[model samples]
Target: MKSVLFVCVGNGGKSQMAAALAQKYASDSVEIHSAGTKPAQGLNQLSVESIAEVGADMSQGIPKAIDPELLRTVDRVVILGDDAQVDMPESAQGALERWSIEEPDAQGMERMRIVRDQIDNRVQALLA
Candidate 1:
């Protein structure tokens, strides 16, 4: 199976959401994991709500510190945004990819959902 790692600054929202989408939409033939450069105290409610709309639960997932071991074990790494790309390990350099996802830490509900839908489509294309 091909393994994919998702990463972001906080790993609480964007990266976690992306990993969840991949798990839900690309479960077959793909293994997914996610972590953050600097773990947030908790997951972002906006992102949580967005993923829940797509039928994926983020309740079980939490913002966790990304260790070198996690990075070392993955086959490929997809950074969810610019900061994540900068935070990737040297060993993962060649395999890293940047996905442009807007941060939804704060905003109205409608904007959050729009950003989530856009990210979902981008993710589907990446995995397809």
Candidate 2:
């Protein structure tokens, strides 16, 4: 099965939400997971609430640091924002895909939701 990996500067909010929604929306065609370039204290509380409100189970969603093995194996590596440009090694990754989503920590709650929806759309489109 093809696998999609979502990443953010920190594995707190957007990465968590994207991973959850990709699993929820994608058929068996794709497998989804998420990690952060830098690990956070925990998953962002807003992401937990935002995903759950949409009926996606994020029980297993939490911020963990990314490893090189996981990084190299992803069929598609989605960088939540421009962070990926400098976040990953400068090496060209044939499998990597970038999406420069806005940072949720500095944004308003409503805007966070909008970002969540936007990421969900990208994930769905990729899987589709």
Candidate 3:
């Protein structure tokens, strides 16, 4: 099984949503995980709403700290948004990809859905 890791500044939104989408798209073949550089206290409501529309639940998601050890376990690492300023661990060996995704903080309800849809497409392509 191939492993994929999603990361962002705050695990509350983008990373969490991406992991959910990845899980939905490739439950059997992909070992999915998400993390944040600086984790928030909770998951973003807008993110939850957006993922729920696609029939994925973000309720079980928590904004967690990135584990450098776990990072090395993945075959690929996806850093959401070109604007992301992440401090990826040196030990994390993988194919690194950066997505220029919409910033969740600035997203409105409609924009949130659009971003979520964009993430779904990327996740689908990754595991296809």
Candidate 4:
């Protein structure tokens, strides 16, 4: 099966939501996971709530650094958000796919939900 790794700078919000949705939409077909360039104390408050509305909990998510071995195996590495500080390493370049999402912390609650929907939509599209 193909695998996907979702990434963000730190919040563990967007990428975590994407991983949950991808698992819901493509469970049997794709392996889904998420990581951040740096670790956060906790997930975004509104982000946890927004994803909860769709049935997946984000409370258990912890932001983590990318694993080089996993990076090599994943079929896709989606960098969420345009403002993220991540710069894809050369070894992972072949699998890179960027999603131009806005950072949840920089915007309002509505915008966070909008990002949530955007991620869910893309996860669905990826499954198709």
Candidate 5:
């Protein structure tokens, strides 16, 4: 099966959401993981709630730093938003993709929902 790693500045929100959505849509067809360049202490409550609204569970999610071994092994590396910067390992064979997603930080719950939808669209296309 193919594998993918989602990344962002803080693993609390965007990357975790994308990984959960990918797990929802891709099932066993793709292996999914997520991390942050600079991880937060915990997940953003709004992000967890927003993903739950769409029937995707984030209970197993946690904020984590990127793993160098996984980075070199996964088939794809997707960086969400522009803030996080990952240096692709020379041993890595995966393709890197940058998603310029909106940060819902100061935008309230409604914007978080919108960002969730935006991520869902991209995740769907990536799995397709």
Candidate 6:
């Protein structure tokens, strides 16, 4: 099976959301993982809630730093949003894609819902 790594500035939100969606949609056909350039202390509450609203749960997701070995081996690496910058290893050069996603500020579940939908669209495309 093909494998993918989703990354963001903080693993708490966008990347985890994408990973959860990917897992739900792709099932065992694809391997999914998520990490951060600078991981947060925990999962983002709003992000988790937004995904659950769509029937994809990320309640067990944990923020984690990017691992170089995983980066090099994954079939694809997706960097969500504009904040996180990952150096593509020689082995993974053509496999990297940077998704330009808009992030919502704290306190608005509606805004977070929009962001979650954006990620869901992209994750669907990736799985396709």
Question: Using TM-score as the measure, which candidate wins?
Answer: 5
RMSD to native for every prediction?
Answer: 2.8, 3.1, 2.4, 2.8, 1.8, 2.0
Give lDDT tens digits, candidate 2, residues 11-105: 88888889889888877877678888788887787777878878986667778877676666667778887764424454525277788666555
Q: Tell me how far the alpha carbon of residue 61 in candidate 5 is from the true structure, in angstroms, after superposition.
A: 0.9
Of 3 and 6, which scores higher on TM-score? 6
Model 2 regions more than 4 Å off: 85-94, 102-107
lDDT of 6 by residue, 47-121 (tens): 999999999999999999988888988989999988899889777633888888775674579888989989989
lDDT per residue, candidate 1, 35-73, as tens digits?
A: 887889998888898889889977678888776776776
TM-score: the better of candidates 1 and 5: 5
Clashes of each: 0, 1, 0, 0, 0, 0
Candidate 5 clashing pairs, residues 3+ apart or interchain = none
Q: For model 4, how does the per-residue alpha-carbon lDDT over 1-128 read when each residue is reduced to its tens digit?
A: 37888888874788888887777677576777798877677788788888888888877888788888777778888888876665556766336888876555546778888889888888888777
Clashing pairs in 3: none
Q: After superposition, how far is residue 83 of candidate 6 from its true place, in Å?
A: 0.7
Query: lDDT per model, in order?
Result: 0.77, 0.76, 0.83, 0.78, 0.90, 0.89
Point out where model 1 deviates above 4 Å: 85-94, 102-106
Could you arrange the candidates by lDDT from highest to lowest? 5, 6, 3, 4, 1, 2
For 5-71, candidate 5 gives per-residue lDDT tens digits of 9999889999999998999999687889999999999998999999999999886788998898999
Model 2: pairs clashing at backbone N, Cα or C within 3 Å: 81-100
- Candidate 6 differs from the real structure by a C-alpha RMSD in angstroms, to one decimal, of 2.0
- In the predicted model 1, the residue pairs found to clash are none
Better of 3 and 4 by TM-score: 3
The worst-scoring run of ten residues by lDDT in candidate 3 lies at 82-91
The top-ranked prediction according to lDDT is 5
Stretches > 4 Å off in candidate 4: 85-94, 102-107
Residue-level lDDT tens digits of model 3 in 79-119:
99865565556776677888877555555778899889888
